[PDB]
Amino acid sequence: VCSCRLVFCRRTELRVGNCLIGAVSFTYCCT
């Protein structure tokens, strides 16, 4: 499952891309 986080992904996740919400790039993380 994936989560849009603020900065870091969890130790259980890898960064797959960005989640862009109102001109700000959050970090898209998947297990």
Add this chain to the structure above:
Amino acid sequence: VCSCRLVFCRRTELRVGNCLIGAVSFTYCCTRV
């Protein structure tokens, strides 16, 4: 729950932004209420 979809969200969902994955800009969608 939120999802990355191609092109359109579902009717019952809120379009909240985009998932940028590799070359593709997907639509970031979340379930309403």
